Amino acid sequence: SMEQVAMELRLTELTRLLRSVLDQLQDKDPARIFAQPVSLKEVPDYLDHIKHPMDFATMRKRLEAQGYKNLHEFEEDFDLIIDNCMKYNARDTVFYRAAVRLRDQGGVVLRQARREVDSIG
C-alpha cells in the first residue's frame, strides 16, 4: 500500500537523522571508551554486573537495520551506555569520568534532536 510506503519513508528519514545524532554523540567520546562492547574475554564477570550492555557499535548496527522506531528508543540505548559505565566503574576512574562528560555534552545534542524529530514529524 501507499500508506506502508509512506511509513517506510518516515522510518528512513528518522534513520538518517539518528545517524547524524549518533556521529555527533560519538565525537563526544574522543578516547573511544564507548566505541565497542565490553569484552567478556577481558571482563569475564561483566554480565553478573550489567544486565543490558550497550556501546556505539551495537547502536550503529541497530540503526542500519532501521531498528529504532523513534527517538525514545535510541535515547534509551544511549542512556544504557552511560548508566552501565557509572555503575560498573567507580567515581574516581577515567571510565566513569568519560561517561559523565558524554552525558553532559550529549544532552545538548539530544535537546535539539528532540526538537528536530517533533518539528519534521
UniProtKB/Swiss-Prot annotation:
This is Bromodomain-containing protein 1. Scaffold subunit of various histone acetyltransferase (HAT) complexes, such as the MOZ/MORF and HBO1 complexes, that acts as a regulator of hematopoiesis. Plays a key role in HBO1 complex by directing KAT7/HBO1 specificity towards histone H3 'Lys-14' acetylation (H3K14ac), thereby promoting erythroid differentiation. Highly expressed in testis. The gene is BRD1. Residues 9-113 form the Bromo domain. It is found in: Nucleus; Chromosome. Component of some HBO1 complex composed of KAT7/HBO1, MEAF6, ING4 and BRD1/BRPF2. Component of the MOZ/MORF complex composed at least of ING5, KAT6A, KAT6B, MEAF6 and one of BRPF1, BRD1/BRPF2 and BRPF3. Interacts (via PHD-type zinc finger domain) with unmodified histone H3. Interacts (via PWWP domain) with dimethylated and trimethylated 'Lys-79' on histone H3. It comes from the Eukaryota. There is a cross-link at residue 41 (Glycyl lysine isopeptide (Lys-Gly) (interchain with G-Cter in SUMO2)).
